[PDB]
Amino acid sequence: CYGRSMATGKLVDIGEAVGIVAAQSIGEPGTQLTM
Amino acid sequence: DYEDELQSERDYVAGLYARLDAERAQSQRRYAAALREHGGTAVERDAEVRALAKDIARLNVADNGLCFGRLDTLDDARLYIGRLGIFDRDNDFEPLLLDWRAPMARPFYVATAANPENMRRRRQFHTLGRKVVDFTDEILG
Amino acid sequence: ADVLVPPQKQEILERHEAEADAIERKYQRGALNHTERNESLVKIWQDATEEVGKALEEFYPADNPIITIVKSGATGNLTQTRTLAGMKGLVTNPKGEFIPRPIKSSFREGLTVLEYFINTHGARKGLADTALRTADSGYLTRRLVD
Amino acid sequence: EVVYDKLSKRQRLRVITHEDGTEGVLSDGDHVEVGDQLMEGAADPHEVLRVQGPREVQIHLVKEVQEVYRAQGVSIHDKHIEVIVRQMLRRVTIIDSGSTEFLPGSLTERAEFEAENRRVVAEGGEPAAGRPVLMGITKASLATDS
């Protein structure tokens, strides 16, 4: 259901902490937005 | 007579809507461009965003009930009283519309039948949607 | 020598100065509110700035290093080139609203005393707001992680 | 005839712009379908959840969150956003407690609500009744059992 891991281009391995990856991906470009 | 005058008023007011729509579209295009590829420092980008949003809001609020009615004058003027001030740039910024919050459009509510502010005839628009259902006039002097 | 100035700049500035003088003539008679006049001048000078930017983009030869850097995608953008060789344009006061007096001179030819003085507001605001930007981003990231 | 009372004059109505209809702006007598936005603006996620079920709030939240980054020059895959959206919709709210051990007025996960209903229907015969509830990041985080 998660699909391929964007960082590796292959099906996500068992045990990947996708929650941390998603949080970091959402938060990294945070400083580039308007306030 | 009355029908022809109503048609002319509808045509002019439709032109006013056309100008409003063109300005709103330009503002929306500039806002969209500034959101994505402004380029520079964040403060200027935010200021541009806020200014474009303010312009969009002020133009958008005026879509419904754009004009309240004509205000003829004895001084050979053709003032139109509405929600916003609109000027034709190519005509040395000829006022096509005057906001009733402006001072030049003050008499609309101050002048009376026995105390005319050099005005000739005051018109009321029964606005509904994108056109006026009809109008009712009052003669002052 | 590589920072060229378009020859069309002066005529555009003169035409828009005539337009600004017309707006000033109209305002005093009471046909426009203060905010109406301010936003009208802002719109006029934004049009002037975009026209100057178009002229600058068309004038520069494709092989100029300044445009070569931008067009190749290495770094920078056309707005920086405009404010460098074209015109700085409108600037904002501390409250975030545009000052109706534009910065005609570019950094290539040098700003006057008052143009430089009013240019400081935006830089100070950005340098002050960077810390809050970082703090807000960190807070959002922390909540999303949690 | 469902009414909306306190709508302020500071807003504008819906637009459609069908290929042949050329509606313009809806004023009166027009027809709209369930879930269509009436007044231009930002919709309420809870209203969307109630009107259009739980699937639609997923799409609405994902799309609205994406639009900001997409329009501000940031590319993030939809899976990252929907991972958080999934956590935002883990729990359901109970109208009144049945034979289950749950006390009323509490928020519980579907993996618990459905399991307890299925276990109590065999003997208790009174499964709990509830509805989906959308939660914020903070409330969802503070509800952890650990």
The two tokens of residue C128 are: 């002050």
Q: Is C22 on the interface with A (CB under 8 A)?
A: no
Q: Are C44 and C85 in contact (CB under 8 A)?
A: no
Residue C97 forms part of a structural domain = yes
As annotated, the binding site of A includes 1
Task: Write the CATH number for C62.
Answer: 1.10.132.30
Strand partners, B87: B95
Tell me which chain B residue has its CA closest to the CA of residue A33. Answer: B42
Q: What are phi and psi of C72, to 5 degrees?
A: -70, -10
Q: Cα(A29)–Cα(A23) distance, rounded to whole angstroms?
A: 11
C-D interface: how many C-beta pairs under 8 angstroms? 7
* Experiment used for this model: cryo-EM
**With the C-alpha atoms ordered D45, D49, D55, D56, is the resulting torsion angle positive or negative?**
negative
* Euclidean distance between the first and the last CA atom of chain C, given in angstroms as a whole number: 55
Q: What DSSP line would sit under chain D, residue for residue?
A: --------TT--B-----TTT---S--SS----TT--SBSSPPPHHHHHHHHHHHHHHHHHHHHHHHHHHHTT----HHHHHHHHHHHT-EEEEEE--SSSPPSS-EEEHHHHHHHHHHHHHHT----EEEE----HHHHHHT---
The two tokens of residue C121 are: 């507001």
What are the chain B neighbours of A35 within 8 Å (beta carbons)?
46
Q: Are C106 and C86 in contact (CB under 8 A)?
A: yes
As annotated, the binding site of A for Zn(2+) includes 1
What are the chain D neighbours of C143 within 8 Å (beta carbons)?
137-138, 141
Q: CA of B80: how far to CAs of A2, B92, C42, D130, in Å?
A: 61, 17, 24, 59
Residue C68, domain extent? 1-114
Q: Cα(C62)–Cα(C72) distance, rounded to whole angstroms?
A: 11
Q: Cα(B36)–Cα(B48) distance, rounded to whole angstroms?
A: 12
All partners of chain C with 3 or more CB pairs under 8 angstroms:
A, B, D
Nearest 5°: the CA angle A27, A30, A33 is 155
Residue C25 forms part of a structural domain = yes
Cβ–Cβ gap B45/A35 under 8 Å: no
3 state SS of C101: coil
Residue C133 forms part of a structural domain = no
Tell me which chain A residue has its CA closest to the CA of residue C133. Answer: A31
Which one of B40, B43, B87 has the shortest CB-CB distance to C80? B40
Cβ–Cβ gap B35/D28 under 8 Å: no
Q: Are D103 and D119 in contact (CB under 8 A)?
A: no
Residue C69 forms part of a structural domain = yes
> Residue for token digits 């403060």?
B43
Our count of domains for chain C comes to 1
Q: Is A35 on the interface with B (CB under 8 A)?
A: yes
Residue C121 forms part of a structural domain = no
Kindly give, in sequence order, each residue whose CB lies less than 8 Å from that of residue D110, ignoring residues fewer than 6 positions away. Answer: D90, D91, D92
Residue C78 forms part of a structural domain = yes
Q: What DSSP line would sit under A1-35, residue for residue?
A: ---EETTTTEEPPTT--HHHHHHHHHHGGGGGS--
Q: Is C92 on the interface with B (CB under 8 A)?
A: yes
Kindly give, in sequence order, each residue whose CB lies less than 8 Å from that of residue C29, ignoring residues fewer than 6 positions away. Answer: B104
Cβ–Cβ gap A32/D80 under 8 Å: no
Strand partners, C92: C98
Beta strands in B27-85 (DSSP E): 67-73, 78-82
The two tokens of residue C35 are: 């905010």
At what resolution in Å was this solved? 3.2
Cβ–Cβ gap D83/A25 under 8 Å: no
3 state SS of B88: strand
Q: Are B133 and B88 in contact (CB under 8 A)?
A: no
Residue C7 forms part of a structural domain = yes
Q: Are C86 and C104 in contact (CB under 8 A)?
A: no
Residue C119 forms part of a structural domain = no
Tell me which chain C residue has its CA closest to the CA of residue A24. Answer: C141
